[PDB]
Amino acid sequence: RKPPKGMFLSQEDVEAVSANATAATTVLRQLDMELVSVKRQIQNIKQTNSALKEKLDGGIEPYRLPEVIQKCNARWTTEEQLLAVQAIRKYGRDFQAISDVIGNKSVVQVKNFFVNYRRRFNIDEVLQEWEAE
């Protein structure tokens, strides 16, 4: 009902190698040459990708900035307020980014802020004006 295990033998396979007196050798060459084809395409991209690895020497280490380990406060200095209105102008509704700029406020009171100070800081025309970008 089934071939010996390891042996490969399908009805489609046998016809293709039996079509003529050279079909077998012809088919075995379409694959010798499909194998070369892929094999030096390999050493191509392997060698493109070795160029890109040099251009990344040193990584991004002269370029990192230390960590602002800053305890999260709750009151709103007028300074912290004006930073906020500008982040809304620059980041729309990305509350994580806005909480990262102001630094000492967590993402919830950013949401809280959007409401309590909504009339007074005119946050709707700001967001409108950010969507235009």
């Binding site: 071939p3 033998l9 892929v38 890109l52 370029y63 930073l83």
Partner: protein, 666 residues
């Protein structure tokens, strides 16, 4: 198997049902009640047992019924019927037995038997033991036919058959207690050796053998599961099917390599896209840093847009600094999966040129067993006889297998150096015309009621005919003769003055440098007491090595043997015999094989007697007069000695049924 049941097995009979032959002789029993069928079967099996437990004496009907017990020894006609059926068809009292009853003073009917090979001999002994006048016509100066044995001094080696294929169900077992044959078992250990001269290591040997066996089952799958049995309006051969299997294994090796490196590209390119991202992102981080440095260069206190510019660039830069870290976490994985994949590459080849040369030896062994190149064997049928294989070890004959035919010939009218040239068969009887092989001058005429032809199939095949049939044989018989295969297989007997080989291995191989020469001197045998090695020529090599002189051939043998054992341990052989069976005009080959486009049905066609037309038009249909036997006429055991012998046993039953009447069918 043991008991009366083992008697049936040892006679190639099922113990628990009746055969087609018995249905024909005992149609009353078979259509009868299930209980009657069963009584018969015990009577048969018990009589077989009595014969088998002592085959050096005749087993008389009287002696049979004494040793039966009731209820079985109650019906005496059934016992007499069963005994006479067994006696007639060579299941008991065949071979070389002592006659309790001396045989009738005057005989009945005359039979001429062409050939005194084993099939001829075995018929002749049966016919003569049935009360017939028998004469055998033999072209050679010796009995045996293709059982040839070389003898010079204490040197003994078979040029013909040399193996008994196992005593389980084998009639040669009976003949073994009857004639003293020193039967010695064959150790199946066969160490291969390449053309370099050095042994193949166990690791390789087990690989290739199992690939060989696997390649064989592959062809069977092709044959019985994909109906790949005709290609280009021609029947497929075994060799054809083996190439197609091998090519498909070679193809699938290449298919696997392509799908492997196709995974390496599918990841090298996922890496390419990944590093183009870490360039274009490191260049944004290189720019933002500049912008943040400048914005932190504006000295405080700052107004709030300029403070937002610092804080904002700082957020934006740590954010791109985080994308770049997740992209080098992911980069790291991709650099590993590429030492994963390129450290586990699939198989480089299917078989190296070395491995194909050892595979070619296992193909020579197969070409040896079937005495023909695999390109000629029918894929469907080449193994149609494997189901009737005998159980047990294979054996050799240490005193030489000629001792069997020589023993059968005891007491028989044999004309040697008598070559039949024409067989004439008509409604009233037959005349055989033979010449003398020495002076073809002296001509002979033999008149008889029946001819039993055991001419080798290669002789029947010969064109122009070596033997003329008058009238000619019908198409249905000549076409079987054309379709069947007659193969070829030769031996070199090497006679030395000292053992220089391993005396504990019966047989060892030599691997050919090329496919075309795979059968050329590929195997050696140490079967005998004396220092004799024996060397096989199989496959396409067999036919070609017959145009090469003895000395050239014995040369290549010593070379190969020097390579194995070192150039100083091999003496020049004292005596050297090379067989040429395709040249032997009383053979034209070694034995038959199931040719592509043939089938086992041809072997039954070879067996059907010929019946001549009526002499007087409108006269009643006559009796058959021309009968055939020999190895090419027995479907389930072709190409062997036991098969010839059985074919002679059956024609004797058939001829006697015809000319003495079969009283046991009432």
């Amino acid at each position: 198997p043991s008991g009366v049941e083992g008697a049936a097995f040892q006679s190639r009979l099922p113990h628990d049902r009746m055969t087609s032959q018995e249905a024909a002789c005992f149609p009353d029993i078979i259509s009868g009640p299930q209980q009657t069928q069963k009584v018969f079967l015990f009577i048969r099996n018990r009589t077989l047992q009595l014969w088998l437990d002592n085959p050096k004496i005749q087993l008389t009907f009287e002696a049979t019924l004494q040793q039966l017990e009731a209820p079985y020894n109650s019906d005496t006609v059934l016992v007499h019927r069963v005994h006479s059926y067994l006696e007639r068809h060579g299941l008991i009292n065949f071979g070389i037995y002592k006659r309790i009853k001396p045989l009738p003073t005057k005989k009945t009917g005359k039979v001429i038997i062409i050939g005194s090979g084993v099939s001829g001999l075995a018929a002749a002994r049966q016919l003569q033991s049935f009360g017939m006048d028998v004469t055998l016509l033999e072209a050679r100066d010796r009995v045996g036919g293709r059982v040839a044995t070389f003898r010079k001094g204490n040197y003994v080696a078979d040029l013909g058959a040399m193996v008994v294929t196992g005593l389980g169900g084998n009639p040669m077992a009976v003949v073994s207690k009857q004639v003293n044959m020193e039967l010695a078992k064959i150790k199946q250990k066969c160490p291969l050796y390449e053309a370099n001269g050095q042994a193949v290591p166990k690791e390789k040997d087990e690989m290739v053998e199992q690939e060989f066996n696997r390649l064989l089952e592959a062809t069977s799958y092709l044959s019985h599961q994909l109906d790949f049995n005709v290609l280009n309006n021609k029947p497929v051969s075994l060799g054809q099917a083996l190439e197609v299997v091998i090519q498909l294994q070679e193809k699938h090796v290449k298919d696997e390599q392509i799908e492997h490196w196709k995974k390496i590209v599918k990841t090298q390119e996922e890496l390419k896209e990944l590093l183009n991202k870490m360039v274009n992102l490191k260049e944004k981080i290189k720019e933002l840093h500049q912008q943040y440095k400048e914005a932190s260069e504006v000295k405080p206190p700052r107004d709030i847009t300029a403070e937002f510019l610092v804080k904002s660039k700082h957020r934006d830069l740590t954010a791109l600094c985080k994308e770049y870290d997740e992209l080098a976490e992911t980069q790291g994985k991709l650099e590993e999966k590429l030492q994963e994949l390129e450290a586990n590459p699939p198989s480089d080849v299917y078989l190296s040129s070395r491995d194909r040369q050892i595979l070619d030896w296992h193909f020579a062994n197969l070409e040896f067993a079937n005495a023909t190149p695999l390109s000629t064997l029918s894929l469907k049928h080449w193994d149609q006889d494997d189901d009737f294989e005998f159980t047990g070890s294979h054996l050799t004959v240490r005193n030489g297998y000629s001792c069997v035919p020589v023993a059968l010939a005891e007491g028989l009218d044999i004309k040697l150096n008598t070559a039949v040239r024409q067989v004439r068969y008509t409604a009233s009887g037959c005349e055989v015309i033979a010449v003398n092989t020495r002076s073809t001058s002296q001509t002979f005429i033999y008149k008889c009621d029946a001819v039993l032809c055991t001419l080798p199939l290669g002789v029947l095949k010969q064109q122009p005919p070596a033997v003329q049939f008058v009238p000619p044989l019908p198409e249905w018989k000549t076409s079987a003769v054309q379709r069947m295969g007659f193969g070829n297989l030769n031996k070199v007997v090497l006679c030395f003055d000292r053992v220089f080989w391993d005396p504990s291995v019966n047989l060892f191989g030599h691997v050919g440098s090329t496919t075309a020469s795979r059968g050329e001197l590929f195997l050696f045998w140490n079967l005998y007491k004396a220092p004799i090695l024996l060397a096989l020529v199989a496959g396409e090599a067999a036919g070609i090595m017959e145009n090469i002189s003895d000395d050239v051939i014995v040369g290549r043998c010593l070379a190969i043997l020097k390579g194995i054992f070192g150039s100083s341990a091999v003496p020049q052989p004292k005596e050297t015999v090379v067989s040429r069976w395709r040249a032997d005009p009383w053979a034209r080959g070694s034995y038959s094989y199931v040719a592509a486009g043939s089938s086992g049905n041809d072997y039954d066609l070879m067996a059907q007697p010929i019946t001549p037309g009526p002499s007087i038009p409108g006269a009643p249909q006559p009796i058959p007069r021309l009968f055939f036997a020999g190895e090419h006429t027995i479907r389930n055991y072709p190409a062997t000695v036991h098969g010839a012998l059985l074919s002679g046993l059956r024609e004797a039953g058939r001829i006697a049924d015809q000319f003495l009447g079969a009283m046991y069918t009432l």
